[PDB]
Write a protein that binds this ligand. Structure first.
Ligand SMILES: C[C@]12CC[C@@H]3c4ccc(O)cc4CC[C@H]3[C@@H]1CC[C@@H]2O
Ligand SMILES: C[C@]12CC[C@@H]3c4ccc(O)cc4CC[C@H]3[C@@H]1CC[C@@H]2O
Ligand SMILES: [Au+]
Ligand SMILES: [Au+]
Ligand SMILES: [Au+]
Ligand SMILES: [Au+]
Ligand SMILES: [Au+]
Ligand SMILES: [Au+]
Lengths: 239, 240
């Protein structure tokens, strides 16, 4: 049915599906600590996550898919999706990251966590690029839905007939979203050359976002290894 | 500053001529395959392809216009994506397999012949497979390799100084020039404007999955250099 939507419909749909911007259960009453910040960013994420599931369902063609496939799409893309959102919100705040309205960290405040400055710089850089290209919200939502539908497809066990028809559907929506991007740029008045040139710059960024994502994934799990679970503690209680 | 002049057709020839030699795995068909045997087999091939990649990068429009440190930064963020896209291209004609080199053609399984490297194989196989069904053209292919070179490392540039931002503009102009080139190749091949934009998007989104395989590869590679390294056993068999 999404395959029916005209460009203008594809835009409103997406725009309305946009999730609420959440607040960090952040408390200035207390100081920031390596682990303090991690759980802070972590809770914000586990909560945005919940809203992400509501959003994914609102995206054209998404629910046309199989439960399994939906879970595989959201399980390969969740962190890219958070990152692009974080990036979008951080545009108006040069040099900083608006994780949430009440949580605005600048570069440095990143060092308040082991090896997470690198991921901050990249995120700052990305937000900076979006700014310099004057990314529009209409453009933004197209890209978020692309990331959903596209980062998990090469990693589908395409061994059976339902899996491949599953993939075609995915690529048709993707083309439909590309049609939309082009329309938005046509409308904005760019020539056809600028059009294809801008579709390319936007898409090539999704690459750097996949990158940050993998970096993030690495840095996140290494945290879950460290400060994972004591023992000297439960034991002392018991004795 | 030459690059930005090149017409589409000139951009393709430049790139096609820049193409590195196809190398042979300097190995023995006699000897079988062990976790450590393979790794070194693929690793040498790679270190050798690496040396050739340097000659290639230097012949890519606008790459030498850049700063030495910016050049090392680009090849360092992308060398493995670059090898990956070439391996994938070469494997097109060999459904289900990976033509690392003419004399080294591993199929899926032969991958398990290395700890946790089946995953990366499948992804490579899947990628080669996608290129096959989209009927990727060599002209299309070389545009994509040069895009990976120029684009995979520009965000991770310390854009804190003036020459650094002018450094980045130049890189984005060549990139636009390469996009122009891709669209020209597709127009010429007769696709409609819709199919044109549509195909430029499918091609570029794959670069994303390549970035992925790259990071996974990077992880798997370094984990090998931690574990599989000093003979130990070998040094003992010897001495003993
Ligand atoms: C995954 C991390 C914690 C959660 C962070 C987050 C949390 C919420 C959000 O909206 C965006 C991001 C982007 C960066 C993420 C971080 C990158 C490193 C860290 O481990
Ligand atoms: C980097 C690895 C070794 C070298 C391999 C290679 C070696 C040569 C080449 O032309 C392409 C590739 C792609 C996959 C690479 C592998 C992925 C995992 C492994 O560690
Ligand atoms: Au994934
Ligand atoms: Au701190
Ligand atoms: Au696909
Ligand atoms: Au990199
Ligand atoms: Au084996
Ligand atoms: Au850039």
């Amino acid at each position: 049915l999404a395959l029916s939507l005209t460009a203008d419909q594809m835009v409103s749909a997406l725009l309305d599906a946009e999730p609420p911007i959440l607040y960090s259960e952040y408390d200035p009453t207390r100081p920031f600590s390596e682990a303090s910040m991690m759980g802070l960013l972590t809770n914000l994420a586990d909560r945005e996550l919940v809203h992400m599931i509501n959003w994914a369902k609102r995206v054209p063609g998404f629910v046309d898919l199989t439960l399994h496939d939906q879970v595989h799409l959201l399980e390969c893309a969740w962190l890219e999706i958070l990152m692009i959102g974080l990036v979008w919100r951080s545009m108006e705040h040069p040099g900083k990251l608006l994780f949430a309205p009440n949580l605005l960290l600048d570069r440095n405040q990143g060092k308040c966590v082991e090896g997470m400055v690198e991921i901050f710089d990249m995120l700052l850089a990305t937000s900076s690029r979006f700014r310099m290209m004057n990314l529009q919200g209409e453009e933004f939502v197209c890209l978020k839905s692309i990331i959903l539908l596209n980062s998990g497809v090469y990693t589908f066990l395409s061994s059976t007939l339902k899996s491949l028809e599953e993939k075609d559907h995915i690529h048709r929506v993707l083309d439909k979203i590309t049609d939309t991007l082009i329309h938005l740029m046509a409308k904005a008045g760019l020539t056809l050359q600028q059009q294809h040139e801008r579709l390319a710059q936007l898409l090539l960024i999704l690459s750097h976002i996949r990158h940050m994502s993998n970096k993030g994934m690495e840095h996140l799990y290494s945290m879950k290894c460290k400060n994972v679970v004591p023992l000297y503690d439960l034991l002392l209680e018991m004795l």
